[PDB]
Amino acid sequence: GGSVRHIAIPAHRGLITDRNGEPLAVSTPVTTLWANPKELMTAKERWPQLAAALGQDTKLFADRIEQNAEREFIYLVRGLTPEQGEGVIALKVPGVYSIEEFRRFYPAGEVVAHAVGFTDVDDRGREGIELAFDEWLAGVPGKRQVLKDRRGRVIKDVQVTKNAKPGKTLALSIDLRLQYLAHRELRNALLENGAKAGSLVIMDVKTGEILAMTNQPTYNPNNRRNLQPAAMRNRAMIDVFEPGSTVKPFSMSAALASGRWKPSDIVDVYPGTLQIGRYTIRDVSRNSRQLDLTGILIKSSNVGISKIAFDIGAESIYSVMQQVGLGQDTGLGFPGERVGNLPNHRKWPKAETATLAYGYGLSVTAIQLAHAYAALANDGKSVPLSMTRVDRVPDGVQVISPEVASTVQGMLQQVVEAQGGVFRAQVPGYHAAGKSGTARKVENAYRSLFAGFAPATDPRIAMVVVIDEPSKAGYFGGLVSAPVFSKVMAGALRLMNVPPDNLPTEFEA
Numbered sequence: 001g002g003s004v005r006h007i008a009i010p011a012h013r014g015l016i017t018d019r020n021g022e023p024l025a026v027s028t029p030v031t032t033l034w035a036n037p038k039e040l041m042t043a044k045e046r047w048p049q050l051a052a053a054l055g056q057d058t059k060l061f062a063d064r065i066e067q068n069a070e071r072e073f074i075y076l077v078r079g080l081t082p083e084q085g086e087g088v089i090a091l092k093v094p095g096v097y098s099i100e101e102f103r104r105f106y107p108a109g110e111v112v113a114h115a116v117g118f119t120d121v122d123d124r125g126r127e128g129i130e131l132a133f134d135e136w137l138a139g140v141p142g143k144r145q146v147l148k149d150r151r152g153r154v155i156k157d158v159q160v161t162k163n164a165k166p167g168k169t170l171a172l173s174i175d176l177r178l179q180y181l182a183h184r185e186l187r188n189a190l191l192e193n194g195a196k197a198g199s200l201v202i203m204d205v206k207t208g209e210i211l212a213m214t215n216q217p218t219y220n221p222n223n224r225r226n227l228q229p230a231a232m233r234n235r236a237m238i239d240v241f242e243p244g245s246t247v248k249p250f251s252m253s254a255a256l257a258s259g260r261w262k263p264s265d266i267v268d269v270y271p272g273t274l275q276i277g278r279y280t281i282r283d284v285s286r287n288s289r290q291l292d293l294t295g296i297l298i299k300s301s302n303v304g305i306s307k308i309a310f311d312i313g314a315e316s317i318y319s320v321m322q323q324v325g326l327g328q329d330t331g332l333g334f335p336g337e338r339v340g341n342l343p344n345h346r347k348w349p350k351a352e353t354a355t356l357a358y359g360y361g362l363s364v365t366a367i368q369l370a371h372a373y374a375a376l377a378n379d380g381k382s383v384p385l386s387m388t389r390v391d392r393v394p395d396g397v398q399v400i401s402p403e404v405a406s407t408v409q410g411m412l413q414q415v416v417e418a419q420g421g422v423f424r425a426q427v428p429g430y431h432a433a434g435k436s437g438t439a440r441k442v443e444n445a446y447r448s449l450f451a452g453f454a455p456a457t458d459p460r461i462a463m464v465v466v467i468d469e470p471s472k473a474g475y476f477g478g479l480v481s482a483p484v485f486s487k488v489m490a491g492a493l494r495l496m497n498v499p500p501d502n503l504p505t506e507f508e509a
């Protein structure tokens with residue numbers, strides 16, 4: 001008797017590690033109890049003890065078997081241990097079977113949840129890297145021939161028709177050591193400032209690798225019960241924000257490349273406002289008259305960068321921001337990753353020219369902002385982004401001339417180190433460079449920004465800190481986000497064994 005059939009052989013999903021082999025997503029065995037209701041219907045006397053062993057009410061269990069009597073497979077319980085999936089088998093109930101199946105476990109939990117994502121109950125990638133690289137990780141199921149009786153019970157294992165092929169190991173660009181550091185410090189900053197959310201991205205300016213990518217709020221992917229959908233957002237890639245003052249270095253790059261501006265050139269920003277018809281550009285610090293181009297960045301003068309933009313024209317500024325990737329497709333293919341928006345016009349009036357120049361009305365992601373600062377730090381050369389470990393670095397694209405990029409770098413080192421600058425971004429033992437931003441959202445709500453890189457002498461790491469809606473008295477990016485940059489950069493440089501470059505001169509010793 002019986003009918004010849006073919007069942008599948010599940011394939012083992014590939015391991016995801018960090019760049020150094022630390023496990024991030026591992027498919028490990030769990031014991032699962034299943035039943036063939038067609039066989040169970042022949043052993044009704046065994047049902048009550050089976051229900052009791054499974055923690056089910058006898059009536060509800062009997063009803064469930066009756067309501068599935070025409071199926072040949074139902075799950076009884078999933079995710080037990082081999083010891084537990086034997087105490088039920090010890091009842092020797094016909095139609096009850098125990099199997100070992102592989103299910104994802106995430107050893108770092110909430111720390112890398114947004115990057116890694118997760119799989120569904122069938123071990124298929126559903127979010128994050130698990131989805132983006134599902135074909136790589138999934139493998140290919142096998143198949144084997146069986147003989148099944150009239151109730152669907154496998155009577156004979158005949159022969160394997162096709163072997164299963166396991167999925168492939170995938171090493172991410174993430175450095176788990178930096179990820180933990182970034183995760184902890186971003187969390188600390190949210191509580192320090194009573195903020196609603198935040199992101200922090202760390203990039204290797206030489207290889208394009210995303211070394212760390214963390215957000216708050218986050219979630220435990222090992223316990224996705226009653227989860228908030230907002231807690232699962234990889235904000236660094238799928239949320240957009242106005243970068244504000246953090247794009248002024250790119251406006252400055254266009255100014256320097258125009259041949260009309262040098263760093264020691266002077267702009268008059270008195271009295272701290274500039275009327276453009278019915279629109280008024282305003283500075284926070286309004287006790288300045290003449291400022292040089294570095295002072296414009298140190299004071300973060302919207303007036304100053306606006307007058308420069310009028311002189312060189314918006315088109316030159318738009319082109320730099322486009323070339324460094326702001327509002328442009330990263331090409332990475334992360335699920336839900338946003339392109340943002342760099343607004344364009346046929347003709348640029350003064351209002352649109354100024355707002356472009358100081359980052360108002362633009363939409364970027366944290367990844368884009370970090371990649372743009374990586375290109376600035378890398379002497380103007382943009383190495384393509386990667387979420388996976390890069391062994392052979394692809395050729396970069398020269399997006400800012402090396403001379404202009406070097407000059408802007410030095411200016412941003414002064415933003416961090418000069419008198420009146422963003423001193424909380426200073427990294428002990430190293431020269432650091434960057435730019436703060438503070439964006440008013442549409443009571444006033446704010447987004448606090450800092451973007452930078454280090455060491456200034458030979459840049460290695462670019463970093464972006466975004467703090468969404470700090471609720472304490474402090475909200476400027478130089479107060480809220482810069483100290484996070486300092487702590488995380490200091491730890492990252494130490495972990496990567498980068499030599500300290502802030503050493504005394506011969507006369508300052």
Ligand SMILES: *C(=O)[C@@H](NC(=O)/C(=N\OC(C)(C)C(=O)O)c1csc(N)n1)[C@@H]1N=C(C(=O)O)C(=C)CS1
Binds near residue numbers: 438439
């Ligand atoms: C750069 O980001 C500048 N920011 C702004 O002009 C914006 N808002 O300014 C404040 C004072 C927060 C306002 O309430 O108007 C802005 C840009 S895009 C958007 N939606 N709002 C200057 N940046 C800093 C800094 O962090 O370095 C300052 C100290 C002065 S404002």
